[PDB]
Amino acid sequence: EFLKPRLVDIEQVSSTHAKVTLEPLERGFGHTLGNALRRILLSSMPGCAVTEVEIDGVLHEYSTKEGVQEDILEILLNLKGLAVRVQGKDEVILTLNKSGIGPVTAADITHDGDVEIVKPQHVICHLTDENASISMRIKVQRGRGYVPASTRIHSEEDERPIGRLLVDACYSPVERIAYNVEAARVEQRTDLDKLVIEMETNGTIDPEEAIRRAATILAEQLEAFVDLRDVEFDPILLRPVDDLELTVRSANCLKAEAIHYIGDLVQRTEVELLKTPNLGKKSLTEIKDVLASRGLSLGMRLENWPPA
Template sequence: MPGNVRRYGEESAKIIGRIVLDASFSPVRRVSYAVESARVEQRTDLDKLVMNIETNGVISPEEAIRQSARILVDQLSVFAALEGTEATAEAPSRAPQIDPILLRPVDDLELTVRSANCLKAENIYYIGDLIQRTENELLKTPNLGRKSLNEIKEVLASRGLTLGMKLENWPPAGLDK
C-alpha cells in the first residue's frame, strides 16, 4: 500500500504481513495470474500459467518477468547450497555427468578421410572412445601413421582434450555403436 494512500491511525494499516511504503517506484502497475488446465496431445494432467502484467512503460512486461525470475533464482539458490540436507547426501550416488562433447561422433572432429576410416576400423565411433586410447594404441592401428596421429592430437587439443584420458562409466547406458 503506497504511503500517500494510507490514513494515519487506520487499523487496517497495522495488519500483520502488510508492508507500508512511503512511495511506489515500481514500474509494474498490476499483475494477475491464473492456473488453468492444459492438454498436450493425450495428456490432460498438465497446468498452464497465464499471467497479465501491466507496466508503466519503463520496462516491458517480458523484461519484468525476466528480472523477477532472475531474482527468484538468486534468492532460492541459497537453499540449493545448504549442507547437511538429504538432497546433498543423495547427490554423490548419482552417476557422474559426461561432457556432451564426448558423446559426439568422431566425424564431428572433421578429420581427414584416412584418419576417420582408421578410427572406424578400430570401432572408435565417439570422441569419448578416442580420448581413452593412448598414442601407442593408435599407432598400432593399420594405416594410421605419425602424421594422422598428430592431426588427431591437434584437433583434440583445440577442444581441450588429449589422448590417454581416463573416463569413468564409459560408455554411458544407451549409447549406440
Template sequence: MSNNNSNQEFVPNIQLKEELGAFGYKIQVSPVEKGMAHILGNSIRRFLLSSLSGASIIKVNIDGVLHEYSTLEDVKEDVVEIVSNLKKVAIKLDKNVSKVELELSVTKSGVVVVTAGDFKTTQGIEIINKDQPIATLTNEREFSLTATVSVGRNVGILSALPTELEKVGDIAVDSDFNPIKRVAFEIFDNGTNETLEVFVKTNGTIEPLVAVTKALEYFCEQISVFVSLRVPSNGKTGDALLDSNIDPILLKPIDDLELTVRSSNCLRAENIKYLGDLVQYSESQLMKIPNLGKKSLNEIKQILIDNNLSLGVQIDNFRELVEGK
C-alpha cells in the first residue's frame, strides 16, 4: 500500500497558548507541514526583530555636563552609565506624535535613585517602566536633564544626527527603537506534521500579539510582489518573454483580479487567463461572450482603468510567449 502522507496538505491553526510574565506570550501554530515550521519560525523571528517601529530617546542634555565622558559630583553613575540607563526607558507615543522633548528635574537629599517615573510627561506620552533607574544621588543636589524622544525603526547607531546636536552638551544616544525584547521558537515533531511554538516578549509599549500581527503584515507586503510572478510552462521561452518587453502587469492572472464570480466565470469559459489576453478584446467581442452583460463589461473596463490599461490592444504572440507554446 502506498503512503500518501508526503502529499497531505495541512492547514495550520493558531492558538494563544499562554501568557508568560509581563508582556510575554507564547503562540502555538499547528499542524504545520514537515520542514515548514523552521522556515515560518525563523521568518517570524527575523521580521519581529527588524520591521517594527517604536519610540526611543535619541539625545540628552544633562545640566552641568559638556560631554559623555564627564562625571557629576554626588552622582554615583558617570555620564556613560546614565546615557545607557536612558536607552532602556520604554516610551509609548500616540500615533500623532513623532518627536517630543521630556524634562526631568529633581532635588533630593540622601541616597536617592532617580527613575524614569520622574520624567514630566504630557498627554500622548507614556513611560512604561517608570521604575527604570536613571541615576543615583549620593547627597542633596539638583539633577536635571532634557531628553529628546523620536519614533524610528531598528537600532539606531547614534540616532541623533550631528545636525540635531544643536546645544552645547547635547549627547547622542545609541537608540533601540524596536519594542521587541526577545523572540524564540521551538518545533515539535508530531510524526506526519509539526507544531511551532513562538515566544514573544516586548518592552510593554506594544502587546505581543499586536507586534506579531504588524510584523507579519509587513512581511506580506514585502513578499506580495512575487504573487503574480509566473514562469513559462516549459522553461524554454523565459528569455523570449524577457526580450519581448511585455508589461509585467499583463501577466497578472484573471483569477487575481477582484471580479465578481459571474464576470470571472465568463472570462474563464472564453479561455481568457491573463490581463494580456483580456486587453486584446474589443467591447463588441466581449459582449458576444455568453452570459456577459453590460454590468460585467463595465466592471471589466473599470478593472482595466485601475491598472492603466484599456481594451483593443494588439499583442503579438502573447499566449505563446507566456505559456511557451
C-alpha cells in the first residue's frame, strides 16, 4: 500500500559534486530516509587513504630534505589529502621519483597496474634546485572510518625499520552531504514527496554506488528487527599430583586424603593437615619443600575448582 522510491534522474555536477533523486515517496518517509541515508553516508563509507610513506633520505617527520621547499610534516599533510581509487587490491604501493625544478604532483606518480588518481594536479612538494631529486614510496590501504596513526598497534607486530612514517587515515570519501524534499510532479496522485540528495566527495566513489551501499547497510542493520523473537587457571596448577617427586609414604597418604590435583594441596593451611594420620613432621617439611620448589607456598585461597 506504499510506493517504493525509485532512483531516477541522477545527475553529476562536477567530478566531486553530485545530485541523486528519489522520485516516489510517501508523506513522512522523505525526511526519515534522507536523515538515515545522510548519517550512514557520513559515518561509514569504504574508501582508500594513505597509511604510511618511506622517503629515501628522510629519517623522521620533523626532519628536512635538502632541495625541497616544504617540511616533511608538510609533505605528510599534503599526502594525507591524496585521493586514489583502487581495484582488486588493498595495499597498493605508489612509488614516485622525480628530479628537476618546480612542484611535484600526483601526475608524476609511477603508472601502476590498476590505480586511478582522481586529480593529477594535487601538489605534494616542491623542488628548488636542478641537481636534487625526490623519491618516496606511498602505501595506500582501504578502510572504513577515521583511524589515527598513533592508536594502531597491530602495525608494530612486525618491527618497522626506522624511516617508516605513519600518517593518519581518514578512509571517508564523502566530505559533505545535504538533502532536501519537494513536491512530486505526479498529478494523478493527490500528493507525493521527492527527495534530492547532494553529495560532495573527493571523487573516489560514485554517488549511485554510495547510495546503494548506504541502503544495503541500513537494510542489513534493520534485518535484526524483522525477527525479534528472544521472548584455577594457572598451567602450574591442574597438574597430576604424582609430579612433585614425593616419597612413598606420602603417596598412600595423599590418595587417602583425596588429594589428586596439585592445586588442592596448596589450599591447605599448615595447621590443618597435621591431624591427617601418619603425616610426619619431617615428611610434611618435604611436602612443603617440594611445593616451595615450585613457588606455591601452602595457604593460598582459590575461588573455583573444576573437576578437570
